[PDB]
Amino acid sequence: AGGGYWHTSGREILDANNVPVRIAGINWFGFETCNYVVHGLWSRDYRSMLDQIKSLGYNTIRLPYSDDILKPGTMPNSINFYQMNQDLQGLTSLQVMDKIVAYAGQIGLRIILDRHRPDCSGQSALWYTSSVSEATWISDLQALAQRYKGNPTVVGFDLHNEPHDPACWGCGDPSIDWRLAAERAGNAVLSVNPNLLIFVEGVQSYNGDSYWWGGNLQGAGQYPVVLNVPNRLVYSAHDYATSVYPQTWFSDPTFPNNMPGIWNKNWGYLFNQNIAPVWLGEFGTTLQSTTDQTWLKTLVQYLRPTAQYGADSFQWTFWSWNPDSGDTGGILKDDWQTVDTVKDGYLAPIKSSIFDPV
Ligand SMILES: OC[C@H]1O[C@@H](O[C@H]2[C@H](O)[C@@H](O)[C@H](O[C@H]3[C@H](O)[C@@H](O)[C@H](O[C@H]4[C@H](O)[C@@H](O)[C@H](O)O[C@@H]4CO)O[C@@H]3CO)O[C@@H]2CO)[C@H](O)[C@@H](O)[C@@H]1O
Helix, strand or coil: CCCCCEEECCCEEECCCCCEEEEEEEECCCCCCCCCCCCCCCCCCHHHHHHHHHHHHEEEEEEEEEHHHHHHCCCCCCCCCCCCCCCCCCCCHHHHHHHHHHHHHHCEEEEEEEEEEEEEEEECCCCCCCHHHHHHHHHHHHHHHHHCCCCCCCEEEEEECCCCCCCCCCCCCCEEEEEHHHHHHHHHHHHCCCEEEEEEEEEEEECCCCCCCCCEECCCCCCCCCCCCCCCCCEEECCCCCCCCCHHHHHHHHHCHHHHHHHHHHHHHHHCCCCCCCCCCECCCCCHHHHHHHHHHHHHHHHHCHHHCCCCCCCEEEEECCCCCCCCCCCCCCCCCCCEEEHHHCHHHCCCCCCCCC
């Protein structure tokens, strides 16, 4: 399944033939950093990497980028061209992105572009900064939309990575109301290609209640994002364990029984109530503590195993494929070749199937 551009129907995503599909993928970061390209191409051929992602059973790649790669002549700076990647030589970050998107389509994978950082220096709480205005943000989203218009390999956009304090959901103040910003951006994107799915993340605090950046969608029920083209919206949340931040609910004595309460509250309810599909965009852990291992086992079950629920479940993209992620580690090990079959083992009940070639 997976043919053509997708659309929502209740809490599910459906391909063009109306067959339900499930995004069960991985994050492959690099384009958002100051290397201006996905990491690991210093040890592997990109195609050999894409083929291995497919082999492990992952069907979608969330590809983080920063507005820097849209500046004229921006080139990658961490690729090795000996006996590999010979065709990426002399190409700009964008042209290298076109190659990755193209091969991914052919082998049956899909891509979701994620505006991870305003610039390669770091993330931002708001969707704009003094150096990267809101208009650049929108022009850039429209440019990428235009660039891949007609190639269903790119199924949709993750508007802004991890909006957080001081951002608000529904407060009505245009300078911090992420809810209004997402509609503003989403509608600009849909004006270029109205078949793209629009993935909108949450904030951090809502009603004095704090949660992971990008994961607080508590205001969504009361203050929905409303787009010009219906059945394109998918809410998104992020959730992590102690390897990232020793949140307090991990110290709760009833842990992990308290978890589904937290999850239901902040994002699950949109799914449970069949309002719209929900995508856990980032989640990972080094699995060093027994707590993260229990957290992962628990969470994997909450997201609904494919054997039981099929496509009527939560969409997900784990973090990350890269082994060079500070406090989460990744599926590959430090050699960019050996799989961490153990961590990979936990995600098995929620993996789905590879899509149709594009
Ligand atoms: O992008 C390349 C870069 O990625 C890093 O991995 C990051 C992800 O990129 C990022 O999206 C994700 O965001 C984290 C953030 O890093 C944490 O510091 C933050 O912790 C917050 C917490 O959310 C709050 O609730 C709490 O109150 O405060 C703390 C901060 O003090 O939580 C968000 C998640 O919502 O985190 C990933 C892992 O760090 C890699 O680390 C880096 O090596 C890569 O180069």
